[PDB]
Design a binder for this molecule. Structure first.
Ligand SMILES: Nc1ncnc2c1ncn2[C@@H]1O[C@H](COP(=O)(O)OP(=O)(O)O)[C@@H](O)[C@H]1O
Length: 261
């Protein structure tokens, strides 16, 4: 019962499918004489409510296992390829996941296509039990999917003038309403364009550029990756953040993430 919920929360398992996909073994053990369909649902619902309402990205991004060799880690490599001190960069990511940098609550992965921006952002978003994506096709409710999430991934679309203030709040980690409210949540933006551009009808303005970049850490990934590089895996995310935690260095609260030690 409640022993199972503790486990689901620890493992970040929100659905029976996931539970089976990730640990088919424990699912069969647990259910063995019987498959209480109600007990299962209750545990999952409870675990999910506990995770979405009170847990944070770090609980799932930071791997539980030691990372002896981080050099093989795709995230580490991508950062390295572009001139970033992976240890310093990891600290930015670590502090970012832990809402350590005040208004700088957003990591912006900028760069031309095939640089690994989506590879990283999506791996991270899929590592946490609950993540939301900013939906610009829905001009009315662009953040509907961003409630009670551990990571918000802004993958596409431009910010509209009608939501810029809300956007600044979310990107800046300040609670804001969208009926339903978005508590501070680490945002990761991936784009090949200046997403600080704001659309107001026929007008495109950069007047909100400074406010916007005051809430971001910007990484510039320009090194096109070989089609062979591979997808950053959930485990790689875990190892990367665990490694970051075990080797954290001081980070400067600056828009541009420096390129060096
Ligand atoms: N699902 C995936 N499976 C295998 N490799 C992937 C996957 N997604 C990304 N990659 C790798 O990452 C590189 C960059 O693609 P992403 O799609 O990461 O790039 P972008 O920077 O344009 O968002 C590709 O060259 C590819 O090798």
């Amino acid at each position: 019962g409640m022993e199972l919920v503790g486990w689901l929360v620890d493992k970040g398992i929100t659905s029976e499918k996931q539970w089976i996909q990730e640990d088919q073994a424990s699912y069969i053990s647990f259910n063995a004489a019987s498959n209480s369909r109600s007990q299962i649902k209750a545990a999952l619902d409870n675990a999910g409510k506990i995770m979405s309402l009170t847990k944070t990205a770090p609980d799932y991004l930071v791997g539980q296992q030691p990372v002896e060799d981080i050099s093989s880690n795709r995230i580490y490599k991508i950062l390295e390829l572009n001139g970033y001190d992976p240890q310093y960069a990891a600290s930015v990511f670590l502090g970012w996941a832990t809402k350590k940098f005040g208004k700088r609550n957003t990591i912006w992965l900028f760069g031309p296509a095939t640089t690994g921006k989506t590879n990283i952002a999506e791996a991270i978003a899929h590592t946490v039990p609950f993540y939301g994506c900013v939906n610009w096709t829905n001009e009315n409710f662009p953040f509907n999917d961003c409630v009670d999430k551990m990571v918000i991934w802004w993958e596409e679309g431009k910010m509209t003038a009608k939501v810029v203030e809300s956007a600044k709040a979310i990107l800046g980690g300040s609670k804001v309403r969208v009926s339903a409210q978005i508590d501070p949540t680490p945002v990761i933006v991936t784009s090949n364009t200046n997403m600080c551009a704001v659309i107001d009808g026929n007008s495109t303005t950069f007047e909100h550029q400074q406010p916007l970049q005051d809430r971001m850490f910007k990484f510039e990934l320009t090194r096109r990756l070989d089609h062979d590089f591979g997808k950053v895996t959930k485990q790689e995310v875990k190892d990367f953040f665990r490694w970051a935690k075990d080797h954290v260095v001081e980070v400067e609260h600056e828009f541009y993430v420096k390129k060096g030690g």
